[PDB]
């Protein structure tokens, strides 16, 4: 398909730009540069993630099943796949020790974000389970008998609705993190996240040697 070819080439370019951005983040963090210039790189990184989510929504319209398969990601990342990506609560837990020290106010804000993320995650998981049973039940009927197109249509829209809701949850989680933390703390957390992803890619290579 043209949409999937475009998505995979676009994703290659996203990965290259993510690498470059990280390489610039670490440099700025080491050179002990001031907050003002660093904030441009931070909001550029967030914009880049936003572009990822937008392009993922575009790919989701073309073929929701491919996005849910995780084939466009490396093998090791697939162990954390859930509706087209990673689990936000675990990535926040992963990065928490490196953004330390947090103030008491920041600590309360982060744990409240964690609780809201967990409850939203459970609700989306239950909704996806319900979708899957409804699809098994509706597909099963089509073969027994010799409306079917309309039902398939609504069912394609339901999958896109789920992936859209997951992308919205991710964008809200990013926004709340960008609002809780200072510029330097946010940069440190983004750095931790980037090194986490790069190490995962290296391990994914290592399992295929």
């Amino acid at each position: 398909n043209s949409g999937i070819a475009a998505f995979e080439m676009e994703y290659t370019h996203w990965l290259e730009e993510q690498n470059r951005r990280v390489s610039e983040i670490r440099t700025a963090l080491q050179a002990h540069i001031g907050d003002i210039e660093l904030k441009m790189l931070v909001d550029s990184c967030l914009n880049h993630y936003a572009n990822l989510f937008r392009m993922k929504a575009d790919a989701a319209k073309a073929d929701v099943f491919f996005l849910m398969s995780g084939m466009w990601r490396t093998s090791t990342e697939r162990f954390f796949q859930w509706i087209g990506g990673f689990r936000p609560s675990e990535l926040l837990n992963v990065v928490m020790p490196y953004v330390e020290p947090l103030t008491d106010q920041q600590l309360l804000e982060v744990r409240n974000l964690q609780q809201s993320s967990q409850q939203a995650e459970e609700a989306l998981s239950q909704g996806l389970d319900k979708l899957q049973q409804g699809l098994v039940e509706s597909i099963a009927i089509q073969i027994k008998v010799v409306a079917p197109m309309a039902s398939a249509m609504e069912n394609l829209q339901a999958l896109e609705s789920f992936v859209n809701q997951a992308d919205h949850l991710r964008q809200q989680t990013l926004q709340q993190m960008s609002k809780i933390l200072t510029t330097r703390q946010a940069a440190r957390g983004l750095l931790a996240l980037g090194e986490y992803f790069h190490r995962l890619r290296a391990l994914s290579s290592l399992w295929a040697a």
């Binding site: 330390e100 020290p101 200072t182 510029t183 330097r184």
Partner: protein, 347 residues
């Protein structure tokens, strides 16, 4: 027969003095850019390290000192002394000014330039695997260490650890000296590797000495000051959990943090500049120890009293004099710093 031996020594020392007239076939390049000419046979015989390095390089010969000896930046006069001992078995003395500080009242026995020169020569003797030179300079440092200030004893202990098991006496002496004194926990953590910090804490707690823990919020302030987070220290002080006086944030920023961080910390004006620490140093004393001119200037424009002394009776002018070598008053950082200090003191 001692006469013929001394003739041999004189001939090889004359070789070292003019290596182009006696077929020099190798060069040792320092970290500054300067180079010393030497002959491959002499150093292949006198030291095993150079024999191995030269046999590996042969598989006009240049040897980068920054690569073979990597754990301590050595000067030029120390390398000259070590190579002179390699050639002629004679300890060549350093030129005047290098092993002497800018304090005319200092005897230049335990001041910082002499300690630095002795450290450089001992590290060179360890890297080159010359046991007699190692023992001689280890004896020198063991004789002088009891008079040097503790902040330099920290550097001596660091280099003693760099020399591994070849310097057991110096390492143990420096460890005992550091344990007996009242060095801040942050200073040990930021001046020594984790192994030495762990060893010193274990030995201190084993002897039943006072090993107080660090306040968690104060430790948070210190790491915030270490990660260039002024706004973090501000948000934490908003909580009123810590005070800049009980945390000695000025001392930390002046001793270990960046210049711009300490400047931004001073621009808030929420801490007594003339406040002391458990070791007895004020902020101006640490500024003199760092030899950073911008800190000294910004401290004098904020009311820093330069007439206060330490527990040993040493003022800021004495610290500035004993931290700079006599070459700069006979990078222009030390010179400028001491000049500014002197100007302020005379005012």
């Amino acid at each position: 027969d001692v006469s013929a031996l001394q003739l041999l020594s004189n001939s090889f020392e004359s070789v070292f003095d003019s290596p182009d007239d006696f077929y020099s076939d190798a060069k040792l390049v320092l970290s500054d850019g300067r180079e010393v000419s030497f002959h491959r046979c002499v150093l292949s015989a006198r030291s095993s390290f150079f024999k191995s390095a030269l046999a590996a390089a042969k598989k006009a010969v240049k040897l980068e000192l920054k690569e073979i000896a990597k754990d301590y930046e050595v000067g030029f006069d120390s390398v000259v002394t070590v190579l002179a001992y390699v050639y002629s078995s004679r300890v060549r003395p350093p030129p005047k000014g290098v092993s002497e500080c800018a304090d005319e009242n200092c005897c230049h026995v335990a001041c910082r330039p002499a300690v630095d020169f002795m450290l450089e020569v001992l590290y060179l003797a360890f890297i080159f695997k010359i046991p007699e030179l190692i023992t001689l300079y280890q004896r020198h440092l063991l004789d002088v260490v009891d008079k040097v200030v503790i902040e330099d004893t920290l550097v001596i202990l660091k280099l003693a650890n760099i020399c591994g098991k070849a310097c057991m006496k110096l390492l143990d002496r420096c460890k005992e000296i550091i344990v007996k004194s009242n060095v801040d926990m942050v200073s040990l953590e930021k001046s020594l590797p984790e192994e030495l910090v762990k060893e010193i804490i274990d030995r201190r707690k084993e002897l039943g000495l006072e090993v107080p823990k660090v306040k968690k919020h104060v430790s948070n302030v210190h790491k915030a000051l270490d990660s260039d987070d002024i706004e973090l220290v501000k948000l934490l002080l908003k909580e009123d959990h810590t005070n800049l006086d009980d945390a000695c944030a000025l001392h930390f920023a002046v001793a270990y943090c960046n210049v711009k961080t300490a400047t931004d910390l001073l621009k808030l004006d929420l801490a007594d500049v003339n406040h002391r620490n458990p070791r007895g140093y004020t902020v101006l004393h640490v500024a003199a120890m760092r030899k950073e001119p911008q800190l000294i200037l910004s401290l004098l424009e904020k009311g820093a009293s330069a007439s206060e002394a330490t527990l040993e009776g040493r003022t800021a002018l004495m610290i500035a004099k004993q931290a700079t070598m006599a070459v700069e008053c006979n990078s222009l950082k030390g010179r400028l710093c001491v000049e500014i200090l002197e100007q302020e003191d005379k005012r």
